[model samples]
Target: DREWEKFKTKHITSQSVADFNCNRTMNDPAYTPDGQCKPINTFIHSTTGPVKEICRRATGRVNKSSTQQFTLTTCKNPIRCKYSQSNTTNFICITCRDNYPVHFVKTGKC
Candidate 1:
């Protein structure tokens, strides 16, 4: 488990997040070049709503049919996720799905 956790740490972050590109790649051993398991990173953030509330709002609004692309920025810890081209801290991704919030709800409803 320690090895797995270390491997996850290489990709997972709390300061800035990214959406794993599911359309471009398959997250399975068969698709891996070295026959090693690969995990997909699915991160979400609420700019105008609580994370939990947003998930609830998206329950019917989003499903297998839903797809989205977004970027995240934060000043809390800028070094971890920064773009040299933009000179700002953020996460970039082409698209993401199936990342509804299950815990750590935001403090509002709408």
Candidate 2:
């Protein structure tokens, strides 16, 4: 097995360093609201394009459990996913396990 620990970074929570992707810089984050939020989502490309890792974080509220980390599968194009704030969406809810409702907090590459 090989060591991977050296790759994980605390800078994931901040944009001052823009540590997540190679194509984007700090300025792009401001253009994307979610990118300013904390605890970055996964984003990447094996080859070309910015692939618009538009949101390392997001503009919407997320109730995701702190223990559950976002998987790489969450990565996608910027056109994907809708904010819960979209009035066009109708939500049904109740407390889950009496632990209160939860949301998919961290969003991904888009």
Candidate 3:
């Protein structure tokens, strides 16, 4: 699938941009054309349908109030196994399952 293709990240130090991109304004039922409805402000348009978080690691920073320090933060793309046993997308909040709403460093989706 196209969403399965590799993904890249922007190492900019804009706090607002990171926040806005990493968090959704609405727990909005709507998602991007890319099939991703998470806070990464991405639209993966996953052909495998809506994938779930598989739990991975990557480097990222906090909001503008900080120096955008890099840390081994939560970095994973939506996957299949994480899919629920229903018709729901389970693409809910940014911070799901005790994880942040982000995926940084360099990676790809399932």
Candidate 4:
């Protein structure tokens, strides 16, 4: 369950797509330990269903690309937490473990 927590903290978001506040949301739902600003992070604006579904029939370690495009926000900035947010629509890439997504690898059709 530890990895699952990190997975949720790093990627999942249920907030309204329009209100993606990088500084706040990253602290609340998408967390990083020690108040450290993540060099980069993404919040997939989706339920766990379609995202988790990618792992259902897939193997671990290998990258699994989502079949459906997802609405998402990316927050980037390692120094001082001054984040720059970008909204994008694309397929996502993730790595799984025990039929669950454990890492946000990248975004695009892979």
List, residue by residue over 1-110, the lDDT tens digit for candidate 4: 67767787668778877887887865652266424565787888888777888788876566788888999899886457678889999998888885888888898866
**Which predicted model would earn the best lDDT?**
4
lDDT of 2 by residue, 1-110 (tens): 01111111211223322234423422245323435333233321111111112222333432222222222222223333321111111121211222222222233211
Q: Candidate 4: minimum summed lDDT over ten consecutive residues — where?
A: 27-36
Instruction: Kindly list the per-residue Cα lDDT of model 1 for residues 1-110, writing each as its tens digit.
Output: 34223322332233333443332222333323422323323333334232223234343323221123234322122233321211222323211123343222111121
Q: Please provide, for model 3 over 8-51, each residue's C-alpha lDDT reduced to its tens digit, 9 standing for 90 to 100.
A: 12211123323433233212334233344343433322322222
lDDT of each: 0.28, 0.25, 0.26, 0.78
Candidate 4 lDDT for residue 89: 94
Candidates 1 and 3 compared by lDDT, better number: 1
The residue ranges of model 3 lying beyond 4 angstroms of the native Cα positions read 1-6, 10-21, 25-34, 38-72, 75-110
Candidate 2 to native Cα RMSD, angstroms = 15.8
Root-mean-square deviation of each candidate, in angstroms? 12.7, 15.8, 15.2, 2.2
TM-score of each: 0.22, 0.18, 0.17, 0.85
Question: Which regions of candidate 4 fall more than 4 Å away from where they truly are?
Answer: 28-30, 33-35
lDDT of 4 at 52: 81
Model 3 lowest lDDT segment of ten = 81-90
